[PDB]
């Protein structure tokens, strides 16, 4: 229960809605990058060795 952490977040970035919107924009930018990278890694893991990315090395520059 990081009550102090939530208190700091509110007092600095939520009391005014202008700051509230700005945090949202930066958060989504970072979130999409992390979400996309993690999801693609999971997809590649489940399908290891079948995607063309995993076999192109056997023909590219070859």
């Amino acid at each position: 229960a990081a009550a102090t952490l939530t208190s700091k977040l509110y007092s600095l970035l939520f009391r005014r809605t202008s700051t509230f919107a700005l945090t949202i924009i930066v958060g989504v930018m970072f979130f999409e990058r992390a979400f996309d990278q993690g999801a693609d890694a999971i997809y590649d893991h489940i399908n290891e060795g079948k995607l063309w990315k995993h076999i192109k090395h056997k023909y590219e520059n070859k």
Partner: protein
């Protein structure tokens, strides 16, 4: 227009200036994010990785 002048209308602008800057910043970042503008984005420490 002449009525808009006066000591207080200047004060009202001063109070709202911080809010105007923040809203302008919100719009600028939103535009860059929506458009995936590589020119500015290439100087972002982590987001730049997306670009290959």
């Amino acid at each position: 227009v002449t009525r808009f002048l006066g000591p207080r209308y200047r004060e009202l602008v001063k109070n709202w200036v911080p809010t105007a800057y923040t809203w302008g910043a919100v719009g600028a970042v939103g535009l860059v994010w929506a458009t995936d503008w590589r020119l500015i984005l290439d100087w972002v420490p982590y987001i730049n990785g997306k670009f290959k």
